Amino acid sequence: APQTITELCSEYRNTQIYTINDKILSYTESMAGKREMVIITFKSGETFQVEVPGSQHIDSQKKAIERMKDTLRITYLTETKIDKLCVWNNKTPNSIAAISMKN
Amino acid sequence: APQTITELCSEYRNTQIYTINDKILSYTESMAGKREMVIITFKSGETFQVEVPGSQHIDSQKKAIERMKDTLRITYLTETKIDKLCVWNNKTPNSIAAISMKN
Amino acid sequence: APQTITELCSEYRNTQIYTINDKILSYTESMAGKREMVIITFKSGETFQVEVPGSQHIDSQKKAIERMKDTLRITYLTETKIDKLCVWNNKTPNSIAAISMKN
Amino acid sequence: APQTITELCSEYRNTQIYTINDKILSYTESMAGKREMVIITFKSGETFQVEVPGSQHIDSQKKAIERMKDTLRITYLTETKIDKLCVWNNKTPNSIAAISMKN
Amino acid sequence: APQTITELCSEYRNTQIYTINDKILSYTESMAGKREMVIITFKSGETFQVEVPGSQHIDSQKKAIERMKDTLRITYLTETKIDKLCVWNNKTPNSIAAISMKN
Amino acid sequence: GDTCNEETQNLSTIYLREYQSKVKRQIFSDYQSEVDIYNRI
Amino acid sequence: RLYRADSRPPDEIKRSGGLMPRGHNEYFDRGTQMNINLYDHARGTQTGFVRYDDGYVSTSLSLRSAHLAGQSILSGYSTYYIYVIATAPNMFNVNDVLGVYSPHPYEQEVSALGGIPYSQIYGWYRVNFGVIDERLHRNREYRDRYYRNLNIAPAEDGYRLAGFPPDHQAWREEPWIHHAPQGCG
Ligand SMILES: OC[C@H]1O[C@@H](O[C@H]2[C@H](O)[C@@H](O)[C@H](O)O[C@@H]2CO)[C@H](O)[C@@H](O)[C@H]1O
Ligand SMILES: OC[C@H]1O[C@@H](O[C@H]2[C@H](O)[C@@H](O)[C@H](O)O[C@@H]2CO)[C@H](O)[C@@H](O)[C@H]1O
Ligand SMILES: OC[C@H]1O[C@@H](O[C@H]2[C@H](O)[C@@H](O)[C@H](O)O[C@@H]2CO)[C@H](O)[C@@H](O)[C@H]1O
Ligand SMILES: OC[C@H]1O[C@@H](O[C@H]2[C@H](O)[C@@H](O)[C@H](O)O[C@@H]2CO)[C@H](O)[C@@H](O)[C@H]1O
Ligand SMILES: OC[C@H]1O[C@@H](O[C@H]2[C@H](O)[C@@H](O)[C@H](O)O[C@@H]2CO)[C@H](O)[C@@H](O)[C@H]1O
Fold this sequence. Notes:
Chains A, B, C, D, E: One of its GO terms (biological process) is killing of cells of another organism. Chains A, B, C, D, E: Keywords: Disulfide bond, Enterotoxin, Signal, Toxin, Virulence. Chains A, B, C, D, E: The biological activity of the toxin is produced by the A chain, which activates intracellular adenyl cyclase. Chains A, B, C, D, E: It comes from Escherichia coli. The complex is a heteroheptamer, with 5 copies of chain A, 1 copy of chain F and 1 copy of chain G. Chain A is α+β, with helices and mostly antiparallel strands. Chain A has one domain (1-103): CATH 2.40.50.110. Helix content of chain A is 24%, strand content 36%. Chain A is built from 2 helices and 6 strands; from the N terminus they run H-E-E-E-E-H-E-E. In chain A, strands 1-5-6-4-3-2 form a 6-stranded mixed beta sheet. Chain F has a single domain, classed as Single alpha-helices involved in coiled-coils or other helix-helix interfaces, CATH 1.20.5.240. By secondary structure, chain F is mainly α. Helix content of chain F is 73%, strand content 0%. The relative contact order of chain F is 0.09. Chain G is an alpha+beta fold. In chain G, strands 1, 4, 8, 9 and 10 form a 5-stranded antiparallel beta sheet that branches. Chain G has a 3-stranded antiparallel beta sheet with strand order 3-6-5. In chain G, strand 8 and strand 9 form a beta hairpin. Chains in contact: A-B, A-E, A-F, A-G, B-C, B-F, C-D, C-F, D-E, D-F, E-F, F-G. The A-E interface holds A 1-5, 8-9, 11-12, 15, 50, 57-58, 60-61, 63-65, 67-68, 71, 74-75, 78, 80, 83, 86, 96-103 and E 25-37, 39, 47, 49, 51-53, 66, 69, 73, 76-77, 79, 91-93. Strand 6 of chain A pairs antiparallel with strand 2 (26-32) of chain E. A molecule of 2 linked components (BGC-GAL) is lined by residues 14, 51, 56-57, 61, 88, 90-91, 95 of chain A. The site of a molecule of 2 linked components (BGC-GAL) has 9 residues of chain E, from loops.
């Protein structure tokens, strides 16, 4: 299976690696209808989203979306640095596919 | 998708932005039948609720209501400052649609 | 909706408010068949329980009983002070309907 | 209902109270087929398990089994002192029925 | 009935015990379709995965795979040392069957 | 008078409540247990 | 790393949630209100304790300086401890915020606003009959990834926390002038 965030990312269309190497500056969570999402931003100006479960998502991803929204809330609260993100850049804001952190 | 809670708030009727920039003063959680909800208040004097799941909530919101109660409980306990809240102001106390935190 | 735990407590019969203002002295959690409940005590001597799910519970209280057990376990581990408790007193130990904490 | 772990432990055939009053020395968690269990050990050498779900478990016990495995991971990681354990002594290792923690 | 991870591991074909005794150096989590998994590495060069659920996993394992990914996220965040891993070596990277941590 | 004194006290309590929140975000987060929302609901 | 000699032991510190200032019992207790004033902290002295009053706890820049302070106030204590502490922005270099008004210049103390939480204490040495046992005991709960990269608060951030009395000329002069609380200056 992929051994790295970068191998994994490269198995997909419309993705791009961001090297962040920093903590989440802000965290936004919405429970508004049809907008049940998390939006995070970094000091450098980038904004990324975990997107709403739609039709572009297979069933196995429904749980993985929830897990990612959990990871993003706890790495914001503990101020853990994110190393890299693999994002779908055909979305605005770009959509998170995988996350890496290391110390 | 929206990039900010202000942007996301304005795409709904009856909402408004409150700029809190403060920790939750008190947290109330109830499992009493028909009033399974959370109510938070701030030093400034406002009171907000996460509403009881109801008919005004489409099904994708049911998992978002649960996550919001989880976020407000760990924010309350670690005393993390809330920055802004998008709330439906056609409810008493007003209902939380979305929350943001910074730093 | 109610704006405070006293106000919400008053809507039910057989309830009463306890002003605890103290952290939990002990936490007991059981998965023994027919006794899947949580019991907490305070140094004042008071003991309270979260009841086993049962016929007196409508379906919306079932996700709320699980949320309440999560709250008491983490309030206990963090030594967070509980302000008030709304309890049904036609039960021994009395059972928690609502909890509030103030920082 | 019971008011202490002893009182609850006494309601079952084949149980016993272990007074631990100590933190967990090692935690083992398994997702291997047919042995999805947790095993804990103390400095005393005593070893306890949360059993694999099975027919000895009524449907209401299954969420409580999952919650107990959640509590044991939290307790191990934060070196929380466990006070007593109620176990079924007809299993090797002995199975946990209920746990209590104090102060 | 297994009392330790080594006994547990020996009940399966194509497993191997690794004595890690170090904390996790990096954590990667993916929600990309058919790649919903967690990859972890250690300073010694070792890389392991928790697999995408699939045909080889029985029903009892579904929940246990979600719990393993939850244990690896929090062990990484709290910098807890892992003692041993029992892995299926017929997968690349080697696949976690069970984890052990002490003290 | 007190206002100088009361302001140093108020400001010093603010910087402390803030650092204390950073510490609670570290040590209390260890107890946060994530929920499987889909089977909960 | 900063260093503080203290008669209060590892277990009492765990219970308190850190090295507390005088009269504060638990690190997070908000009930018993605590007066915090750096000038007042800095001038006072205590017997059987390295300065720890008015909401701040002092530390030394070296093990040797901490031991010299401990012997002067704790000599005939059959055992006492020297705690090793990570730098973090609750810490203020007292000479840098009080400046030419720093009361015990030659000591070069760094004070922690509100105490030092238990997770910021890296470890400790035992001192038996005034002689340090060279083995450091490491605190299992030290938050290494968090504290790894933090440092002392810059003096800029403490001038408005100096706590000089309202009539003290320091409030009428640089740097403190640009930072005076409303009611001083
Ligand atoms: O899985 C989220 C991801 O989906 C991409 O959209 C694809 C999807 O991956 C593919 O399997 C399906 O056949 O068509 C979808 C068209 O929307 C999105 O392009 C990407 O932005 C993510 O949303
Ligand atoms: O979603 C919670 C929110 O619902 C509002 O009602 C909306 C509802 O979301 C939508 O499905 C329906 O079609 O339109 C309603 C407004 O016209 C409530 O008014 C609001 O207070 C919240 O409860
Ligand atoms: O909901 C927990 C609560 O139930 C009370 O019983 C009520 C119940 O809430 C109500 O829905 C039903 O119509 O009448 C019951 C009383 O006859 C219990 O009284 C209380 O102790 C809790 O167990
Ligand atoms: O609940 C786990 C516990 O089950 C015991 O088995 C019981 C079972 O729980 C009960 O429903 C049935 O009526 O009697 C069984 C025989 O005692 C096991 O004995 C115990 O070791 C645990 O596995
Ligand atoms: O359960 C994860 C584990 O599965 C192994 O495959 C098993 C399969 O579960 C079982 O149905 C069959 O009878 O035997 C297979 C071989 O032991 C994989 O081999 C292993 O790598 C894991 O993926």
